[PDB]
Amino acid sequence: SPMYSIITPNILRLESEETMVLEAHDAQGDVPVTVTVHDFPGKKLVLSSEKTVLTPATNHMGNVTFTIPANREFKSEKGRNKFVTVQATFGTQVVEKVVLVSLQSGYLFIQTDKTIYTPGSTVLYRIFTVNHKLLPVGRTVMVNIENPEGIPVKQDSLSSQNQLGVLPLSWDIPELVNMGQWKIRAYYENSPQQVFSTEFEVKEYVLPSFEVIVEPTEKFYYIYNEKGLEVTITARFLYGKKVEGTAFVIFGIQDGEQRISLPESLKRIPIEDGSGEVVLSRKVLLDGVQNPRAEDLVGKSLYVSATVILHSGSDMVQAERSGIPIVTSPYQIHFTKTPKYFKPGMPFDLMVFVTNPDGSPAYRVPVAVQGEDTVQSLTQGDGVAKLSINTHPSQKPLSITVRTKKQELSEAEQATRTMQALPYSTVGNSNNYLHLSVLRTELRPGETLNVNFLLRMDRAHEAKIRYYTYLIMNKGRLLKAGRQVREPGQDLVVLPLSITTDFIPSFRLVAYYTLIGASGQREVVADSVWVDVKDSCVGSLVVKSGQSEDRQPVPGQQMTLKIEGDHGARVVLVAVDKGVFVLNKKNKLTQSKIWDVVEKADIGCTPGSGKDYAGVFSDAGLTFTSSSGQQTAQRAELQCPQ
Amino acid sequence: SCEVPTRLNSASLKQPYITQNYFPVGTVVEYECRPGYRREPSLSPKLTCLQNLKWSTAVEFCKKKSCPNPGEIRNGQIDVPGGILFGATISFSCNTGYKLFGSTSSFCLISGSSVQWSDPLPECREIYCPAPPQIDNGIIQGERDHYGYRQSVTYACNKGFTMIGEHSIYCTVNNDEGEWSGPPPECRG
Amino acid sequence: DEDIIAEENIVSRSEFPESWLWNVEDLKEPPKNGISTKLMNIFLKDSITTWEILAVSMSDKKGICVADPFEVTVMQDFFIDLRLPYSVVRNEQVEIRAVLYNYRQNQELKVRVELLHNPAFCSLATTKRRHQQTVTIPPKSSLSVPYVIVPLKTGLQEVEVKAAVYHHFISDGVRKSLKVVPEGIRMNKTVAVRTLDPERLGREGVQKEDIPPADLSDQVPDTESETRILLQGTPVAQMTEDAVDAERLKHLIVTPSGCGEENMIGMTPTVIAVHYLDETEQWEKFGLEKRQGALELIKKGYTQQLAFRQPSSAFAAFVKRAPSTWLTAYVVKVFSLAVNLIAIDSQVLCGAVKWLILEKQKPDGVFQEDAPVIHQEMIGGLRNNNEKDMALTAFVLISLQEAKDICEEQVNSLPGSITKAGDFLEANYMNLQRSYTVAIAGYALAQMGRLKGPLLNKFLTTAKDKNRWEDPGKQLYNVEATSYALLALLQLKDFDFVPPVVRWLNEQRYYGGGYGSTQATFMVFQALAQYQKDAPDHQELNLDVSLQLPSRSSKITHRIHWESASLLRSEETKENEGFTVTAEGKGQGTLSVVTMYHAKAKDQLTCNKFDLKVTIKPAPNTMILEICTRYRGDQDATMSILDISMMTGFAPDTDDLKQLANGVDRYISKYELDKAFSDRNTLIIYLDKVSHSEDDCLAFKVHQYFNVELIQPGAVKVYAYYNLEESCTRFYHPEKEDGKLNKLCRDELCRCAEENCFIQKSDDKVTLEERLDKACEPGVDYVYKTRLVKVQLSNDFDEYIMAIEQTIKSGSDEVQVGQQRTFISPIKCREALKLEEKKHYLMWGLSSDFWGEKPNLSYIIGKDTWVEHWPEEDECQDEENQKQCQDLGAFTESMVVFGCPN
């Protein structure tokens, strides 16, 4: 009767605090639990060892937080992934499971001062050394600098110890050097495969002294828009004033990497009061391509090339907007946020994701299920809609198509998309499911989330399910485990889960229950869900003006710089001439790209759920192991499936 | 008559009012800025004598003279406690890994016909660590000419030898003195 | 002047970084709502622009955080933008622009803009003349000011313009620097690419490698050249071939069953499969979960081997049967290998070792067998009779030393028995005929290192084709003897003799299991697991790379071991040296050395894309400017630009512009149109196209509104809209020939000559004292009384062949009386000089007015050259001329007799 379980993350990492969830269901009295971690298969060592006691007053829920030191046994050789044997002794009952170990110590970020540089100058660049939880760590880092052709010309070996995770560095570009794209490559010494890179351009250049912004009225082009692609060429000096001169503008069509220039769209237009208008008429466009069929242009993109010359002929600037999509619909729909498996007879939730042709989230866009007009839902700030459909008990493939219902537009312009959700396979067809629902809203830390636990199963055994077990996954680690009380007859129970800065940017909730039923069979039923959080800083960093707003600065003037940030932190500044960002604005540093990296290194590969319970688990990035034999699938791959 | 114009810190009387003492009412006296102060065009440098035997109240005719911008110190810093005006002081410091060579402070002093910083801007020299120890039966995987703050040295034993210790060591800096994190490893045969 | 800021008081703006404020501040102030607020004072640079300020934070609690950009816009009501290019070619005349901005709402400014003279540049502003234009700038507008120059020294140089307004207290200055570059073109040559591999041709006396420097004989003087050098690493490191795929061992997981012997036949393939899989780390491909299940079967074989263990600590098929030594030596062998796998009791294993030793050892060292095993096929080759005192003593021997470490302290007779069985295999090793008995007997002496000399030789020679130990009969024996031999040379370190054996068993593709396949399986997998754990001689590759360059004193060593994510090392030297590189170890590498520089070239591609001819002729008050252009493609160029600047004090004709403005593929913005005649020094004519077949010519009248003495050549530039670089710029001036400012150059050294042709003066105020003081200061190098014999005319530079009649003072040119020295002058100075043949002159100059070398030196008449007409003899009797004959004659004897004061 007592069934002891153990849960850990799919992939454990080194020099990191991995948490482990210990359980004993239908257990009595106290239960001594000892946890040990051994290398695989040799078992030459004892990397971790903890002891805890499970007590009825914790309802027999334990937790061991352990660390895997970075022994020299772990690396290589070579290309050969390594593994540990997690062992958990409950009294006399022993449960063991092999888990995969990541060498990746965490992350590195590189930041250069400028984006582009002139032969003869110094590139100032800082490396940010942080673990998986993003806090600064002191370790050794190798740093290379590769040329255009992909050749290292310099390698240094350094460590962020006592450097507060801030490693300053410099490199003098020689005056004799190859033009083009240069790369800074850097990696942690204990993990040479995961590499972190930043590009900086080396070119013979001058400052234009003014900027040119080209903006199409719509961020896209609608193939049947007769007016055509109308663009506003604005030009102003860096210090603010608007420019007087003359502009040449041309248009083009891009397909992947191949570009076709439209010679007959070349216009020369007068820039008055720092602005100018120029339009690409549908006619010329269709004339430049040799296709009569218009729909063949959908998927491809358009680019605009601007050349504004000051009436002095003393300065001439080049600009270009690119990747203006040609589309039949002013929106796109994605189910990348929706799970791919439902539970027969239970509500199935859809996370529809509507973007603007560029990739940006579309605000206030109504969407709906075909055949169900009732089911309607609007997109929030992040561009997502929560639609819910009640499903029938049957093993037939659910196929769901969705469209937009944005008014003002036509049915033809509405977007559409179609997925297919398969049924959750039950343990011997017991027809016992669990479903986790979450209110779709742009989540902020400090708010409280209402997690909804809906249970479905025959009345012969509901009175036995008294509690659910939940686990929070974040950044690829176990942020928190816990228990949800349930009384008999309670279909829906709610969990008030407080959101802190630790849940940023995204977190997974997986919860499950177990019981004996059918014909004496031990049953585990689980369900997961992936919830997004408002990407930001764990803390805050604002830079603004200390002085009065009236006092404009003058060359050689002393001015006050206010900095508002987290106490104790260290701030690293830099001031670049906006002329630089007229030449090259790429590979800039943002907090969002940080959260982006953090994101790409999640062990969870699915919006939630799974073909089965061992699937809910492995898909969410966890390993669930028991003393009756109800085990997960052996994860052999560090990367997520294509 | 009014008493002698009161002493001013900025400007001092001109000739020949400085040697006069007979100040009949309705008299104007002209000042000229001291060193180091500069005249404020929009303001009159003259003063006048009142009925109750006083002078026309005036805020100081010459404003305080400014020093030339201290500048920038490659990998060092300039601490400017309170402005760069005549009589001001500034201090110098180097960034970690760099040592100070020169004056630790500078003063805005009066030179000839103007104010100039008392000392020249010093230099911050990269603090190099002493050459890494050569170990028996091993070598330093691709050495280096100079090892600075944070530079690390990786070691490797020869064939038929076993490494026992830290694969590599790094340079730490304490009181402008470079010192190795610790002892290099050993290659036991 | 009056009511303006003088030239020396004005500070030019010099600080124009592209990035600055690379600073580090700490937020240690008292926090309000977990928010600390720090205040910093910064002195903003000299740029007139907008700075973008980006801050990143790091807190051991809140982690990293990138702040939003913060823009600071720095401006001034009046200022100048000096727009230089990145680099300019040396001796090439180019135009630079200086734009004066007036951002005052409704207040026009009468400004004066002046270029400062720089010896490195030859422009209109000199030592002796300023170059100041007076111009008016309307409210909210800009005014372009063109300057033409020619850079005189390669390397970095410095332009600096200044400007001040009239009647107001406003002044501004811009000091920018620009790189002056030599003409040549980039060439990359390969110096040496040799393959670094000790052993193959690189002799056992480890390869030494001599690398010469590069040619660089056509390297244009005063240029750096870098030598980069790379060490490309080789990825090839086959262990043998490949370890045997785990998927091929699926049959080796057998449930142990039966009695004392068969249960060992069932525990054999299972123990040796996991052991091999733990070592080949193929547990993945095989299935990780399957390990726990194979360990349970190994524990099941061992528990069931406990039931056939007799009280004497020995083993036999049954419990009532007499114990077999070979079996007990197999129990010992297998259990000695399944120690790391399961929990093996020491009492049992060491008990059977003690039993074997005390019971089953003859005095003379050879184990004897009393009770042959029922399963005779399970013995392997030992069954084929012949010299079984060896096959057996070697078998039980191998079982005892592999049980060494575990039963050394529990059995004290073990070292002695080991040595005992070894002295005997040692004495009778030379009398063995079978390949098998010698392969086990040598693996049996390999472990003690007592395999040397003649026995060694016989062991190596024993094998056929250097890859196998085969005997007539079954192949299983030959694979078993081969596996013993493989272990024998792995103990031997003989990494040369290994490569061919391994290839043979993999080739055999024996994957164990079969009728009597116990040994074959245990040996082939102990051998292929030790082949993978001992790894012989790395099997990978080790390369030390020591490089010596006579430039540095230090020696550079590069270790390129395998299993390192790099396999690349590169070093660079700024000096072309001869360096030698010794390499060392196993492995095949390569070393390629590349130097880089600029070679002599003639070039002059440009105009690459456009032809241009600009001619300026007089009008029938005004002059005519005709522009002629043409495209150098296969097609007619698209929309091109015609950028024109005017000569100083000149404005284009409005009516002729209106006439060009109207259609005909030509355009001019209303802007250039409504500029008055004043202040129109720049103009842009847009071209809908240009032909590639013939010249496209236009022409318009230009009028002089403002008269000045030193006028600046105008300049025209063509170029298509898509491309700035592929442009052409010609200059135009009515007289000035070639549109080239006056400069005398030889090879690549040239000096500007836009100045007074000589010391401007009239012989009347020039007295004797002013001659003794000016002809004795240090600079003055030479002073001669000369006579003009011959004058040679040209199109650009005149040559006045002066015959020295007396050397008053001698300047580094060691010139005797009678010899000739050529004096050269620009044509514009022919009128200022009026030198005539057969006349005499008093001349003196500096050392900088030298041209040439010593056997052909030429003098140049610069602004410090004193040129004075010496009246003839029949002109000094004349009374009005007297003061000069008498002053020149007194200067002759005051410099000849006495000279200089010192």
B chain contacts of residue A159, beta-carbon cutoff 8 Å: 150, 152, 170
Q: What is the 3-state secondary structure (H, E, C) of C726-747?
A: CCEEEEECCCCCCCCCCEEEEC
Q: Which CATH architecture has domain A537-600?
A: Other non-globular (6.20)
Q: Output phi, psi for B69, to 5 deg.
A: -45, 125
Please name the amino acid found at residue A20: M
B chain contacts of residue A167, beta-carbon cutoff 8 Å: 150
Residue B85 located in a structural domain: yes
Residue written as token pair 């000279």? C899
Q: Given an 8 Å threshold on Cβ–Cβ distance, is B139 in contact with C556?
A: no
Nearest to C48, CA basis, from C12, C83, C81: C81
CATH code of the domain containing C857 = 2.40.50.120
Q: What token pair was written down for C27?
A: 């937020």
Q: B7: Cβ–Cβ under 8 A, 6 or more apart, which residues?
A: none
Residue A100, classed as helix, strand or coil, is: strand
- Count the helices and strands in chain C (H runs, E runs): 18, 42
B171 in Cβ contact with B150 (< 8 Å): yes
- The answer to whether residues C168 and C155 belong to one domain is yes
Report how far residue C631's alpha carbon sits from residue C612's, in angstroms, rounded to the nearest whole number: 9
Q: Where do you find CATH 2.60.40.1930 in chain A? A: 1-106+601-632, 107-207, 432-536
Q: A432-536 — its CATH code? A: 2.60.40.1930
Residue written as token pair 């982006």? A596
Please name the amino acid found at residue B134: Q
Q: Given an 8 Å threshold on Cβ–Cβ distance, is A157 in contact with B154?
A: yes
CA gyration radius for chain B?
32
Alpha helix (H) residue ranges in C166-288: 262-280, 283-286
Whether the ω angle into residue A78 lies within 30 degrees of 0, i.e. cis, is yes
Report how far residue B131's alpha carbon sits from residue B145's, in angstroms, rounded to the nearest whole number: 8
The set of chains that have 3 or more CB pairs under 8 A with A is B, C
**What is the CB-side half-sphere exposure of residue C369 using CA atoms within 13 A?**
25
Nearest to C556, CA basis, from C542, C573, C539, C536: C573
Q: C725: Cβ–Cβ under 8 A, 6 or more apart, which residues?
A: none
Of A72, A159, A556, the CB nearest to B150: A159
Solving technique: X-ray
**Chain C CA closest to residue B155:** C559
CA gyration radius for chain A?
29
Flag whether residue A140 sits within 8 Å of chain B, measured between CB atoms: yes
Residue written as token pair 């176990």? A478
C729-736, Cβ contacts within 8 angstroms, sequence gap of 24 or more: C729/C94, C729/C95, C729/C612, C730/C612, C730/C613, C730/C614, C731/C93, C731/C95, C731/C148, C731/C614, C732/C614, C732/C615, C732/C616, C732/C625, C732/C647, C733/C616, C733/C647, C734/C616, C734/C617, C734/C618, C734/C623
Give the gap in angstroms from C-alpha A192 to the nearest C-alpha of chain B.
15
**How does DSSP assign A310-355, residue by residue?**
ETTSS-EEEEEEEEEEEESSS-EEE-TTS-SEE-TTS-EEEEEEEE
C27 in Cβ contact with A566 (< 8 Å): yes
How, if at all, do strands B105-110 and B115-117 pair?
A: antiparallel
Q: Output phi, psi for C661, to 5 deg.
A: -60, -40
- The answer to whether residues C597 and C703 belong to one domain is no
**Domain hosting residue B59, numbered range:** 11-63
Beta bridge mates, B28: B48
- The answer to whether residues C201 and C121 belong to one domain is no
Q: Given an 8 Å threshold on Cβ–Cβ distance, is A140 in contact with B170?
A: yes
**What is the CB-side half-sphere exposure of residue A237 using CA atoms within 13 A?**
20
C367 in Cβ contact with C324 (< 8 Å): no
**Chain C CA closest to residue A107:** C64
Q: C453: Cβ–Cβ under 8 A, 6 or more apart, which residues?
A: none
CB atoms within 10 A of CB B104: 10
A chain contacts of residue B153, beta-carbon cutoff 8 Å: 157
B69 in Cβ contact with A554 (< 8 Å): no
B chain contacts of residue C561, beta-carbon cutoff 8 Å: 156
Give the gap in angstroms from C-alpha B79 to the nearest C-alpha of chain A.
14
Give the gap in angstroms from C-alpha A136 to the nearest C-alpha of chain C.
6
Report how far residue A313's alpha carbon sits from residue C644's, in angstroms, rounded to the nearest whole number: 8
Q: What token pair was written down for A342?
A: 């439902």
Q: Output phi, psi for C480, to 5 deg.
A: -75, -35
Q: Given an 8 Å threshold on Cβ–Cβ distance, is C542 in contact with B159?
A: yes
Report how far residue C89's alpha carbon sits from residue C180's, in angstroms, rounded to the nearest whole number: 6
Q: Output phi, psi for A597, to 5 deg.
A: -65, -55
Nearest to C766, CA basis, from C603, C596, C878, C883: C883
B chain contacts of residue C495, beta-carbon cutoff 8 Å: none
Residue C350, classed as helix, strand or coil, is: helix
Interface test with C, best of B85, B143, B155 (most C CBs within 10 A): B143
Report DSSP state, residue C809.
E
Alpha-carbon distances of C660 from B119, C636, C637, rounded to whole Å: 65, 21, 20
Which CATH fold topology does A107-207 show?
Answer: Immunoglobulin-like (2.60.40)
Residue C386, classed as helix, strand or coil, is: coil
C416 in Cβ contact with C358 (< 8 Å): no
Please report the resolution in angstroms.
Answer: 4.2
CA gyration radius for chain C?
50
Report how far residue C344's alpha carbon sits from residue C301's, in angstroms, rounded to the nearest whole number: 11
CB atoms within 10 A of CB C20: 21
Q: Is A9 exposed, middle or buried (0-12, 13-18, 19+ CB in 10 A)?
A: buried
C22 in Cβ contact with A573 (< 8 Å): yes
Which of C493, C515, C537 terminates a domain? The answer is C537
Give the gap in angstroms from C-alpha A142 to the nearest C-alpha of chain B.
10
Flag whether residue A556 sits within 8 Å of chain B, measured between CB atoms: yes
Report DSSP state, residue C379.
G
A329 in Cβ contact with A414 (< 8 Å): yes
Q: Given an 8 Å threshold on Cβ–Cβ distance, is C18 in contact with A114?
A: yes
Which secondary-structure segment (H or E) carries C501? helix C499-508
Report how far residue A86's alpha carbon sits from residue C421's, in angstroms, rounded to the nearest whole number: 45
A389-396, Cβ contacts within 8 angstroms, sequence gap of 24 or more: A389/A347, A389/A348, A389/A350, A390/A347, A390/A348, A391/A342, A391/A343, A391/A344, A391/A345, A391/A346, A391/A347, A391/A348, A392/A344, A392/A345, A393/A344, A393/A345, A393/A431, A394/A344, A394/A423, A395/A344, A395/A423
Which of C567, C584, C605 terminates a domain? The answer is C605
A61 in Cβ contact with A31 (< 8 Å): no
- The answer to whether residues C895 and C798 belong to one domain is yes
How close are the terminal C-alpha atoms of chain C, in Å? Answer: 39
Report how far residue C267's alpha carbon sits from residue C255's, in angstroms, rounded to the nearest whole number: 7
CATH code of the domain containing C382 = 1.50.10.20
Q: Looking at A55-134, which runs of residues are DSSP E strands?
A: 61-67, 82-90, 93-102, 106-112, 116-117, 122-131
Residue B4 located in a structural domain: no
Flag whether residue B81 sits within 8 Å of chain C, measured between CB atoms: no
Sign of CA dihedral C878, C883, C884, C887: positive
Q: A208-329 — its CATH code? A: 2.60.40.1940
Flag whether residue B142 sits within 8 Å of chain C, measured between CB atoms: yes
Region for residue C550 given its phi and psi (left: phi exceeds 0; alpha: psi -120 to 50; beta: otherwise): alpha
**Domain hosting residue C138, numbered range:** 77-184
C chain contacts of residue B95, beta-carbon cutoff 8 Å: 24
How many residues make up chain B in this entry? 189
Please name the amino acid found at residue A472: I
Report how far residue C476's alpha carbon sits from residue B80's, in angstroms, rounded to the nearest whole number: 89
**How does DSSP assign C665-706, residue by residue?**
TEE--HHHHT--STT--EEEEEES-B-SSS-EEEEEEEEE-S
Number of separate domains in chain C: 6
Q: C106: Cβ–Cβ under 8 A, 6 or more apart, which residues?
A: C139, C140
**Chain B CA closest to residue C40:** B80
Please name the amino acid found at residue C601: A
Q: Given an 8 Å threshold on Cβ–Cβ distance, is A312 in contact with C179?
A: no
Nearest to C456, CA basis, from C496, C480, C485, C478: C485
Nearest to A184, CA basis, from A149, A152, A140, A137: A152
CATH code of the domain containing C108 = 2.60.40.10
Beta bridge mates, A361: A355
Q: Does domain A330-431 have CATH number 2.60.40.10?
A: yes
Q: Given an 8 Å threshold on Cβ–Cβ distance, is B143 in contact with C43?
A: no
Q: C647: Cβ–Cβ under 8 A, 6 or more apart, which residues?
A: C702, C711, C712, C713, C714, C732, C733
Report how far residue C237's alpha carbon sits from residue C537's, in angstroms, rounded to the nearest whole number: 11
Residue C483, classed as helix, strand or coil, is: helix
- The answer to whether residues C418 and C457 belong to one domain is yes
- The answer to whether residues C294 and C376 belong to one domain is yes
Beta bridge mates, A25: A3
- The answer to whether residues C777 and C729 belong to one domain is no
Beta bridge mates, A351: A386
C650 in Cβ contact with C702 (< 8 Å): yes
Report how far residue C39's alpha carbon sits from residue C56's, in angstroms, rounded to the nearest whole number: 16
Flag whether residue B174 sits within 8 Å of chain A, measured between CB atoms: no
Q: Output phi, psi for C891, to 5 deg.
A: -75, -20
Residue C500, classed as helix, strand or coil, is: helix
Q: C863: Cβ–Cβ under 8 A, 6 or more apart, which residues?
A: C127, C128, C755, C756, C758, C759
CATH code of the domain containing B106 = 2.10.70.10
Sign of CA dihedral B36, B38, B44, B46: positive
Q: Is A69 exposed, middle or buried (0-12, 13-18, 19+ CB in 10 A)?
A: exposed
Nearest to C22, CA basis, from A126, A153, A556, A221: A126
Report how far residue B140's alpha carbon sits from residue A532's, in angstroms, rounded to the nearest whole number: 49
Of B142, B145, B159, the CB nearest to C558: B142
Number of Cβ pairs < 8 A linking chain A and chain C: 344
Whether the ω angle into residue A41 lies within 30 degrees of 0, i.e. cis, is yes
Q: C212: Cβ–Cβ under 8 A, 6 or more apart, which residues?
A: C191, C192, C578
Number of separate domains in chain B: 3
Beta bridge mates, A453: A436, A493
Report how far residue C89's alpha carbon sits from residue C154's, in angstroms, rounded to the nearest whole number: 8
C762 in Cβ contact with C779 (< 8 Å): no
Report how far residue C890's alpha carbon sits from residue C193's, in angstroms, rounded to the nearest whole number: 76
A381 in Cβ contact with A363 (< 8 Å): yes
Query: What is the maximum alpha-carbon separation in chain C?
Result: 160
Please name the amino acid found at residue C785: K
C chain contacts of residue A568, beta-carbon cutoff 8 Å: 27-28, 36, 59-61
Q: Output phi, psi for C429, to 5 deg.
A: -85, -30
Nearest to C525, CA basis, from C238, C336, C279: C279
Q: Output phi, psi for C358, to 5 deg.
A: -75, -25
CB atoms within 10 A of CB C663: 8
Alpha-carbon distances of C747 from A603, B50, C750, rounded to whole Å: 69, 80, 8
How many residues make up chain C in this entry? 902
Nearest to A199, CA basis, from A181, A187, A186: A181
Residue B1 located in a structural domain: no
Q: C188: Cβ–Cβ under 8 A, 6 or more apart, which residues?
A: C594, C595, C596
Q: Does domain A1-106+601-632 have CATH number 2.60.40.1930?
A: yes
Q: Output phi, psi for B175, to 5 deg.
A: 70, 55
- The answer to whether residues B93 and B54 belong to one domain is no
Report how far residue C777's alpha carbon sits from residue C901's, in angstroms, rounded to the nearest whole number: 10
Q: Given an 8 Å threshold on Cβ–Cβ distance, is B142 in contact with C41?
A: no
Report DSSP state, residue B138.
E
Q: Given an 8 Å threshold on Cβ–Cβ distance, is C556 in contact with B69?
A: no
CB atoms within 10 A of CB C201: 8
Q: Output phi, psi for A640, to 5 deg.
A: -75, 150
B chain contacts of residue A157, beta-carbon cutoff 8 Å: 151-154, 168
Interface test with B, best of C11, C46, C493, C557 (most B CBs within 10 A): C557
Flag whether residue B159 sits within 8 Å of chain C, measured between CB atoms: yes
Residue B6 located in a structural domain: no
Report how far residue C476's alpha carbon sits from residue C467's, in angstroms, rounded to the nearest whole number: 16
Report how far residue C91's alpha carbon sits from residue A94's, in angstroms, rounded to the nearest whole number: 88
Beta bridge mates, A95: A88
Q: Given an 8 Å threshold on Cβ–Cβ distance, is C559 in contact with B159?
A: no
C chain contacts of residue B159, beta-carbon cutoff 8 Å: 538, 542
Report how far residue C488's alpha carbon sits from residue C502's, in angstroms, rounded to the nearest whole number: 13
- The answer to whether residues C194 and C239 belong to one domain is yes
Flag whether residue A159 sits within 8 Å of chain B, measured between CB atoms: yes
C chain contacts of residue A120, beta-carbon cutoff 8 Å: 179
Report how far residue C875's alpha carbon sits from residue B75's, in angstroms, rounded to the nearest whole number: 75
Whether the ω angle into residue A549 lies within 30 degrees of 0, i.e. cis, is no
How many residues make up chain A in this entry? 642
Which of C739, C756, C791 terminates a domain? The answer is C739
Q: Looking at A486-631, which runs of residues are DSSP E strands?
A: 492-498, 506-517, 521-532, 541-545, 558-565, 570-572, 575-577, 622-626
A chain contacts of residue C37, beta-carbon cutoff 8 Å: 562-564
Sheet with A570-572: strands ordered across: C24-26, A570-572, C56-59, C63-66
Which secondary-structure segment (H or E) carries C441? helix C435-446
Q: How do the residues of chain B divide into helix, strand and coil, expressed in percent and rounded to 5?
A: 0, 40, 60
Whether the ω angle into residue B68 lies within 30 degrees of 0, i.e. cis, is no
